Design a protein around this ligand. Sequence first.
Ligand code: HEA
Ligand code: HEA
Ligand SMILES: CCCCC/C=C/C/C=C/C/C=C/C/C=C\CCCC(=O)O[C@H](COC(=O)CCCCCCCCCCCCCCCCC)COP(=O)(O)OCCN
Ligand SMILES: CCCCCC/C=C\CCCCCCCCCC(=O)O[C@H](COC(=O)CCCCCCCCCCCCCCC)COP(=O)(O)OC[C@@H](O)CO
Ligand SMILES: CCCCCCCCCCO[C@@H]1O[C@H](CO)[C@@H](O[C@H]2O[C@H](CO)[C@@H](O)[C@H](O)[C@@H]2O)[C@@H](O)[C@H]1O
Ligand code: CUA
Ligand SMILES: [Cu+2]
Ligand SMILES: [Mg+2]
Ligand code: NA
Ligand SMILES: [Zn+2]
Lengths: 49, 58, 144, 79, 43, 73, 46, 227, 84, 98, 105, 259, 514
Amino acid sequence: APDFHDKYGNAVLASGATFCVAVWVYMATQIGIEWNPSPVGRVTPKEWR
Amino acid sequence: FENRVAEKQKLFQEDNGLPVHLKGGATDNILYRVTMTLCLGGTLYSLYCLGWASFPHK
Amino acid sequence: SVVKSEDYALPSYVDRRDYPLPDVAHVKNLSASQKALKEKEKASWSSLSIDEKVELYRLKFKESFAEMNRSTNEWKTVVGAAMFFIGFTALLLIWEKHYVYGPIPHTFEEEWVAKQTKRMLDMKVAPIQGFSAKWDYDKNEWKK
Amino acid sequence: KIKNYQTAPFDSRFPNQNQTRNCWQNYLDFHRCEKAMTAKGGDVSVCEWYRRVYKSLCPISWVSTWDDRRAEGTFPGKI
Amino acid sequence: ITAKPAKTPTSPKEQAIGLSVTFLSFLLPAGWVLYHLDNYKKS
Amino acid sequence: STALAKPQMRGLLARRLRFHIVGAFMVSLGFATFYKFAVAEKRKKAYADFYRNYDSMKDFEEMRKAGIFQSAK
Amino acid sequence: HYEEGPGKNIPFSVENKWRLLAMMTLFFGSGFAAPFFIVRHQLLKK
Amino acid sequence: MAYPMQLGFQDATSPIMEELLHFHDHTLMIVFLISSLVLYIISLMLTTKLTHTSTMDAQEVETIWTILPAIILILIALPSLRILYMMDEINNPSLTVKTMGHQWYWSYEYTDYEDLSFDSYMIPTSELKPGELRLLEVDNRVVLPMEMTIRMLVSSEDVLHSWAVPSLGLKTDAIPGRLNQTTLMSSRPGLYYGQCSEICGSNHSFMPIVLELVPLKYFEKWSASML
Amino acid sequence: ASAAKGDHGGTGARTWRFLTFGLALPSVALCTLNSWLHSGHRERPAFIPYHHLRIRTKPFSWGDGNHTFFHNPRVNPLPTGYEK
Amino acid sequence: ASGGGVPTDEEQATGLEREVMLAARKGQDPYNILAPKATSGTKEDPNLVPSITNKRIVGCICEEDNSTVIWFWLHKGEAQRCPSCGTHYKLVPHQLAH
Amino acid sequence: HETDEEFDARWVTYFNKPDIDAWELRKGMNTLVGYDLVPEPKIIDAALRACRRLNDFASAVRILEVVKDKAGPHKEIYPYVIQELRPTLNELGISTPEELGLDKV
Amino acid sequence: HQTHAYHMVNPSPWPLTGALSALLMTSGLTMWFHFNSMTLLMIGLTTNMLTMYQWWRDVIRESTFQGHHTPAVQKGLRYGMILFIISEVLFFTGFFWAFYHSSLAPTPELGGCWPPTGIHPLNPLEVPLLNTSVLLASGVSITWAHHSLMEGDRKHMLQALFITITLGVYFTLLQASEYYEAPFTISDGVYGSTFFVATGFHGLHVIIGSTFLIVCFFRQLKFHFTSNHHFGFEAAAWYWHFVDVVWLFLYVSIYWWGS
Amino acid sequence: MFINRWLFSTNHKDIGTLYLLFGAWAGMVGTALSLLIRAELGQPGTLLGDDQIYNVVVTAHAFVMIFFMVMPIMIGGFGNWLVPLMIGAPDMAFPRMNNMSFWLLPPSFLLLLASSMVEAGAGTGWTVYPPLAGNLAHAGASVDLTIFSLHLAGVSSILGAINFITTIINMKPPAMSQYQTPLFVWSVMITAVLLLLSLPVLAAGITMLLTDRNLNTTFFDPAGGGDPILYQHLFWFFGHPEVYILILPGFGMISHIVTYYSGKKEPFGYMGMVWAMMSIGFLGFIVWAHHMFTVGMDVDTRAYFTSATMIIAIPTGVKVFSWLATLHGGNIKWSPAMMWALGFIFLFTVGGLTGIVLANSSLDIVLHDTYYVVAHFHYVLSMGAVFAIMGGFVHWFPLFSGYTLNDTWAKIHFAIMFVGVNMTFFPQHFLGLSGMPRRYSDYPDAYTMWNTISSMGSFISLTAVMLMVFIIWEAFASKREVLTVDLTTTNLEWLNGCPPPYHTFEEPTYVNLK
Ligand code: HEA
Ligand code: HEA
Ligand SMILES: CCCCC/C=C/C/C=C/C/C=C/C/C=C\CCCC(=O)O[C@H](COC(=O)CCCCCCCCCCCCCCCCC)COP(=O)(O)OCCN
Ligand SMILES: CCCCCC/C=C\CCCCCCCCCC(=O)O[C@H](COC(=O)CCCCCCCCCCCCCCC)COP(=O)(O)OC[C@@H](O)CO
Ligand SMILES: CCCCCCCCCCO[C@@H]1O[C@H](CO)[C@@H](O[C@H]2O[C@H](CO)[C@@H](O)[C@H](O)[C@@H]2O)[C@@H](O)[C@H]1O
Ligand code: CUA
Ligand SMILES: [Cu+2]
Ligand SMILES: [Mg+2]
Ligand code: NA
Ligand SMILES: [Zn+2]
């Protein structure tokens, strides 16, 4: 006789994965967090003196 | 002095269900109550003192 | 069959690969037909039916090796639920960013960074491998 | 005269990381020498090497406190 | 290990309540403090 | 109606251990070789090549003209 | 003598799971809250 | 200085720091190898249904697992100790400079010939010039001659601090009443940064060190202009 | 060592009493003599306000904050010198 | 030089101390101070395990110098065997206090 | 230790004791499966015959299961052993776990 | 009913009053050092004394009066006391380490010498030699006491124990008087620091040990000890030899070699 | 009744339980402090205030995690519950003194909280070095409260150590030699020996700090001829043994957990494990100055401390390898306790190895007082000791309580914690190698990335801690009563049932000498 995992496992996996990816991608890119990545290959040096 | 240990053995082995710290009789109870009162009272007072010391008096 | 708390000091039943013959039978009390079955078991086993053999097995043991060793879908619940709570953690981080953290220092503005990056290059920060080594001073660009 | 000093050289007596005693010893030597020279009728210039070494090594605040203490009569070393 | 079935089973719903109440008891007081940090830092 | 051959029945766990510990050893040598090429030699050759024709006065002069120094304009 | 057995060898009651939830919440939650309130206390002095 | 997302050591600026990089590569390789072997064996122990639960004899395999780690430690200690004694070698410096820790800034004394000393404080974030580094710049740099052996003497006039410059492989505690010595030798001109490395109270995070390495002739004129 | 005496046939109460009164107490009596002889107040040294001495980083929690716990006026100067 | 006046254990020991002392005199060990000596442990010569109740935990050190001890309840009735080495133990219930 | 043949003979003899009791039957099997091997057909043969003399059909079946289990992923072993045991299985009327449906989860 | 030989102790309030008294003494010291008040401290010291008194009283009730101290229990108490003494050795060790560290590398503030400039050490051949003869002699009288107790000799036990305690009290009075006569103080740099703290904790131990001997003296007067069972006495004796040996190390290191 | 039982206890199980409750509450405090740390560092800039408030938080974090959470849980909690059960003893040797070891802890903790409430708190580092901890740079009562807090925790542990040593030496069945006692019991005895020897030296050093601060002594003050470095030697003479004290009982539980879930009757190489714990215990007293490679010590001293520190890898490597050899051939049960233990083995090894990096004084010049040190000790403490505690807790909770946890929830808890602690601490190796110092409320902009990730990880651990509380509630809420436990023949602590009666072994076990 089918237990909790047989009945809900696939749903808990699918929707847990989807939720976690979505909310981490949102947090990482949409709220103004400064990650401070390398300037290398991204920043054009500008005159400072 | 005479050896009165046998009398004390009888007293402390009396089957009256008393814990050893109260088994000497009514004075144990008094001394216990003084001790615990001083300890509990003193502890409340140390908490009052921390409360006082926790704030500036400019 | 029915196990009680106050039997902890008695030999008990277990299903374990590495202890195939437990200390007691799974079932100790026998009905009338079960008693007759234990008698029939004293004669040739060839005269036992398949059903009777299965029933002797199930008197002696609770689960077969195949039943006891079966795999489950638990992993899905475990992984999915862990991802859920890790997900929920990002909400706490979002709340924190919105309500707790103020602006970061002005030295992270894009123009400050571009200027700082030139100055790091002018000062040859990490010129052997780490930083300036990656800048082409001849072509005035990041090494491709 | 025998000088041309850059800085205090390695001294085999104080070969380790803690140089406190090197400063101190050269400070005492300079002031001992200064007192010997000023007394017996001679020249402080022979004390010079010790002066250079201690000046190079010793933090200004130490030399300055030691000098105040000699003037006060509270310097604990023997000069 | 073997065990008996729960004497007072805790259903999915009841678990969602204990879990919510548990997380809230940690999150709300600290949240309140952190949220009012600026009010503290200059007052 | 063919019988099956007697297979190996003893020391199966031990045999598996031996095989894979010997495997682990081979992988470790392969990684040591790799690492002493992509990390350790790479580092020595980066430093060696950097200093081979390095001219410290020319380096200073470039830094000076870029305006970085308090003591040198 | 003393009560023995599951739920009886402990200084708190597990008779009612909701009352227990409340107690565990006050107990663990007071521990976790204390540093935040201490920080607040320090902030609000000077 | 460190740059964004740096993984390893700042590039070496002195021969000694270069020596530490090669010795760290050697040790790191050993760390990866051992920890990856452990993880691998764990996974090997856990991925079979074959069993052997009876008493296992130990006094044979214990040899291997005591002698092999012993050999490995000696292979670490040998280059470790060679570098340690190198760092201790007599060198004859051309110049002695003192630094004194304070709450919360450094002072420097160059008293070989003249009486030169000055304080060196963090540039506040609101006063950074464009392209300057938050928390790292000071008002007065420690100007020193490049390519020369310098003796640094370190102390404090209040609490403990510690004087560090990662690129040169330096860190020497600053202890009041004590005069600690280290030597410094930069292979290159430039600016080399460090930060106080002993907890010293309210502004521990905000008392950085900046060395400016230049040719002897510029260092001499700077010293004179600084009296 | 082996001391210079003997017994050892059996160390008992009698022997340890013998040692108490025959050796230990006479030694105490001799040292007591020696002490209550070499005593007499030696003349107190000139006061010099050395900075490594008479330390005050915080007032003592008794008296006026400036006297040590077993302050002796005769022999213990204050940071400003001997008392009146 | 000498006299008396100090009570002896014989005169003054009491409670459980006195019980252990009197039992030791009769060569007895009601309070389990000593290690029992093994019999051969066969079906015919089982180790005899005293008890004041109807079961007692046995620990069996199957071979001399084993660091692993095998623990089981020994119940009143037929001899039981150590699950590791098969040596036999038999419970001999009751008494101690008369 | 000892040779393979001596080890097997020792176990054959253990299970062949005419008056082997229930306790010894279990002790033997539970000890045997601690070793890093799947027991030879001759050893299993003697353990099955001991089950017969003890009137214990269900333990005979369980013994065949433990042989399978001890082979782990070496799927060739258990059918070889069953093949070798077939005259004994037919003589004693022992049905395999497969014939009983006890291999199904 | 138990059939092992160990003591199950009656549930007791003394651990709790003990712990609270430690809170009241530490709070009290803080209050005294920083808030000019002695009240918490006095209350802590009072509850501390009450706790020790009742707890040890109860130990005597359990052993002399109720008979729970079988040999296995006594043997436990032996290990307990030995371990306790070891922990006390390591505590003193830290003070000796502090002493040797400062005095072997005297810093420039001291004059770069030991004893520091301006320190005039006590003569070790005077009262400190007397103190040494007193503790050593007390190690002898206490051994006479032990042997008398084992031989069943009540009167000589009491005589030797009394002599031992008088010697402890003598040492204490001499040391009080030295403290008062000393021309240097605890504030006289590291010299006064190591001297007073080390010999001060030592003096504290002499007082504890003397008190423990006095307790034995009264228990003996009341006939508690038998000629074979007297662990309280052995423990006080061990502790006494410990206090003697620490003194010898203080004498050799601080009074003699550090002069 | 309630007061007699829980305030006046003389029972080793009840006292264990009080320790576990105390330890779990301390854990919540320590967790909160660590989230304050990581909130301050989670983005560049100043969140709380300057370094004072910040380091008051860092200092309290360390004191709470070490003295209030780890030691009470391992030694007071597991030691008290399991050691008497594992040797068949009716209780500890000194059942009443055992209770005072417990009750000293709440006052000790109250003193620590007091110091953080008065003045500006003790922002000294858990090492409490003068002169910053002296009466000029830290005037007022905070440091004195911290010192007195440590005095009380020290007395608690010295009396505890005397109790464990006596119980273990003196209260075994007469037939059981020391080489027949379980590894957990060995680990606790070795821990108690280190406590006995090391805590009094700390007590001496902090008492000297106390007198410098209040009685005008100058042990640590150059002006009176003292030396701040003498405090470091006294502190570390204790502090290195202290870290072996923190891990040893964990090693002890890992040995039982691994043996148990491998279906084994015994750990591989028992005498090798006893030897390794003893060697580690002994070596841990002769390496303390590796905490001092930058203070200015002679080169030969540094060479000695480097070499003697490294030798510790050998006995520790014997244990790690013996754990693997215990798994080998096992009928592996993948229980939550076993996952904790398997994570312990790997992550402890990692942290041990980065300790071996730090042992090299040449490299330690550059790593000392950076986050490379923080990464090392959090692998061994926040993964090592903490995993051993979680493993032990889930394995033995059904013994202590008579109820089972939900294993699926416990596995979920493990998985979140594992991700969280690795996310938190692994990037701190990069921050250390690249030079980020310790005890900074803020860092140059370059370090922003790894600090951001590290703070995020700490939030994931927070989630695991909250889930833990819910899980314990759910076990008590549901009341699934334990029935059968396997392998009692080699796990004596289980043989009296779950929970065992108040009084166990009133009649002792029977063990033949033969
Ligand atoms: C549980 C606590 C714990 C433990 C067990 C350890 C274990 C070790 N620690 Fe650590 N450490 C701390 C907690 C701990 N540490 C703390 C808290 C600090 C900071 C104090 C502070 O300043 O606040 C610290 C600091 C510290 C320093 C000072 C660094 C600095 O401040 O600059 C050093 C230096 O040598 C060090 C080294 C070691 C070593 C060599 C071990 C060894 O015991 C590790 C041995 C283990 C292994 C090596 C892995 C297993 C072995 C193998 C698989 C075999 C093969 C291995 C080899 C062949 C190398 N540690
Ligand atoms: C046991 C020791 C321990 C533990 C577990 C931890 C856990 C954590 N610590 Fe650490 N920390 C130290 C001891 C520890 N710490 C020490 C000694 C220092 C040095 C102090 C100094 O510099 O002076 C320090 C320093 C320190 C710093 C450096 C501060 C600085 O230099 O400025 C940081 C920053 O990230 C940090 C973060 C964390 C985090 C995020 C956790 C998290 O991983 C915590 C997540 C929570 C848990 C792992 C714990 C829960 C366990 C329980 C709650 C009990 C459960 C109950 C039962 C089973 C009954 N800590
Ligand atoms: C007579 C010989 C016997 C000695 C005992 C004397 C009685 C006083 C009470 C204290 C006993 C405590 C022992 C050690 C404590 C430190 C210093 C005490 C040694 C001493 O008595 O030193 C005196 C200083 O007194 C001072 O400050 C003392 C001021 C008293 C303050 C006590 C400070 C309490 C400190 C508590 C620390 C306790 C922590 C210990 C932890 C143990 C492990 C947990 C010397 O006097 P002086 O005038 O400077 O010089 C003499 C000049 N004519
Ligand atoms: C102004 C004075 C106050 C100063 C504060 C300290 C005060 C004094 C402490 C002095 C200690 C008194 C100890 C008295 C103990 C009496 C109880 C006792 O001695 O109990 C004995 C057991 O020993 C036992 O518990 C052994 C008990 C050992 C106790 C060890 C005492 C040391 C205490 C040190 C605490 C200070 C900390 C140090 C500071 C750094 C009882 O067994 P027996 O003697 O065999 O008797 C039984 C026979 O009769 C049977 O025939
Ligand atoms: C490091 C561990 C902590 C992790 C982060 C905490 C996770 C978030 C928990 C939320 O806690 C609450 O959040 C609020 C907002 O979301 C608050 O409302 C405040 O703000 C409001 C909304 O603007 C007002 O309605 C109210 O007056 C109120 O004061 C506040 O009280 C608080 O309890
Ligand atoms: Cu100065 Cu940190
Ligand atoms: Cu260490
Ligand atoms: Mg440091
Ligand atoms: Na910050
Ligand atoms: Zn056996």
